[PDB]
Write a protein that binds this ligand. Structure first.
Ligand SMILES: O=C(O)CCCC[C@@H]1SC[C@@H]2NC(=O)N[C@@H]21
Length: 233
């Protein structure tokens, strides 16, 4: 039941606040502005007006795999945006939501004590996109040519997250493998993964474990580490 909100006008980071405050699971902390945002395309643009920045607590004892989780959340984020805008979106392993070549959303997940802090940033109404990420990022406004009710968006997103997380629990990742893999970005293309190494080859798909399958010279390798980031090559 992700439907009750805590909407602030400015914080250092919704991630940090939930790391500090003791909130109940299933409640989303939203912030119009973030002075010390962290993750994805940087801190500078996470302080822009028009973006949708929020975080929420999940039970660590209940969502053990922090590789499939980001994918399911990303799948939930894209599904909500597609339902709203009726625009096709792609998923970039292992977390980002993309429209074509540029990112629209990113899923962050941290752990602290007995907390699983999930932070999600969505590009909705930012009008003045930074020149340094004009190439890698886009907004709902830029794509569709109109603004969107950030509250309406957040609600349908929280709903999909809720609905999908219930299935991911009751059932398994098998329920989303096909949905996710079929929306994967750079699929069939030459790509390069970096993090705890650097593997380069053709992204051939997604394993039932949520791992990225790369076709190298000596076989297809399955990448499970969340450390890795997937970029073109
Ligand atoms: O870009 C990413 O992939 C990571 C998530 C983007 C940042 C979100 S926005 C709200 C929350 N608070 C943060 O400091 N980070 C996350």
């Amino acid at each position: 039941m992700f439907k009750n909100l805590i909407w602030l006008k400015e914080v250092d980071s919704t991630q940090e606040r939930l790391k500090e405050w003791n909130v109940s699971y299933g409640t989303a902390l939203v912030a119009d502005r973030q002075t010390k945002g962290r993750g994805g395309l940087g801190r500078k643009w996470l302080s822009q007006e028009g973006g949708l920045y929020f975080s929420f607590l999940l039970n660590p004892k209940e969502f053990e795999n922090l590789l499939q989780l980001p994918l399911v959340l990303g799948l939930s984020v894209s599904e909500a945006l597609e339902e709203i805008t009726e625009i096709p979106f792609s998923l970039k392993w292992p977390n980002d939501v993309y429209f074509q070549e540029k990112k629209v959303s990113g899923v962050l997940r941290e752990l602290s004590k007995d907390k699983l802090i999930v932070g999600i940033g969505i590009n909705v109404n930012q009008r003045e996109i930074p020149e340094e990420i004009k190439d890698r990022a886009t907004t709902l406004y830029e794509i569709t040519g109109k603004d969107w009710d950030r509250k309406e968006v957040l609600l349908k997103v929280l709903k999909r997250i809720s609905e999908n997380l219930k299935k991911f629990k009751e059932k398994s990742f098998k329920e989303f493998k096909g949905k996710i893999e079929s929306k994967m970005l750079y699929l069939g293309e030459e790509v390069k993964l970096l993090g705890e190494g650097k593997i380069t080859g053709k992204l051939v798909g997604l394993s039932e474990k949520g791992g990225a399958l790369i076709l190298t010279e000596e076989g297809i390798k399955e990448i499970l580490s969340g450390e890795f980031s997937l970029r073109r090559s």
